[PDB]
Structure 1
Amino acid sequence: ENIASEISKSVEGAIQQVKNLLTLAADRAEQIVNDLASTTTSTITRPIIELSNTADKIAEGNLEAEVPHQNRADEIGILAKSIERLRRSLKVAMESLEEALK
């Protein structure tokens, strides 16, 4: 009931309000990691694994498909274009080999 309690407790609500905002801010910051794992997966991981499997199929003797995503504007596109140079080099060599048979 006393003056000190009346005055001091009057700011308790406000402080909870401040804390509520801070908790929303903290939880939003906490979500960045899972979302970034997601982005990295779709943006980089998938394409890299795809390109790796493609390199492996080509090394194994499948030369029929142009390497996917050569059109991409970033370093994944650069990479994919380099693998296509490899595919074409292999394909010319195999074609010349086939011409030598018999």
Structure 2
Amino acid sequence: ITRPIIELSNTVDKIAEGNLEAEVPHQNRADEIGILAKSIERLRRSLKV
């Protein structure tokens, strides 16, 4: 749980700095980390568009 959350926190920081190309990890987990990851991916795509 701890490491993936740190990782996704990192991912959100890169998106904030304008890097809309960095891959979002953990999109395929079957739990709540998975759901958070799918959210961040959708956010990433929404900002590209």
TM-score for the superposition, normalised by structure 2: 0.91
Unpaired runs of 5+ residues, structure 1, are 1-43, 93-102
Give the greater-gyration-radius structure (CA): 1
Unpaired runs of 5+ residues, structure 2, are none
Q: Which whole-Å CA distance do the structure 1 matches of 2:33 and 2:18 have between them?
A: 23
Identity over the aligned pairs, expressed in percent?
Answer: 98
Number of equivalenced pairs: 49
Greater RCO (Cα-Cα under 8 Å, separation 6 or more) = 2
Q: Which one has the bigger helix percentage?
A: 1
Q: Which whole-Å CA distance do the structure 1 matches of 2:36 and 2:13 have between them?
A: 15
Tell me what 1:47 maps to.
Answer: 4
Which shifted more, 61-70 or 49-58?
Answer: 61-70
Give every structure 1 segment of 4 or more consecutive aligned residues whose post-TM-superposition deviation is greater than 4 Å: none
- Contact 2:11–2:22 (CA<8 Å) still a contact in 1? no
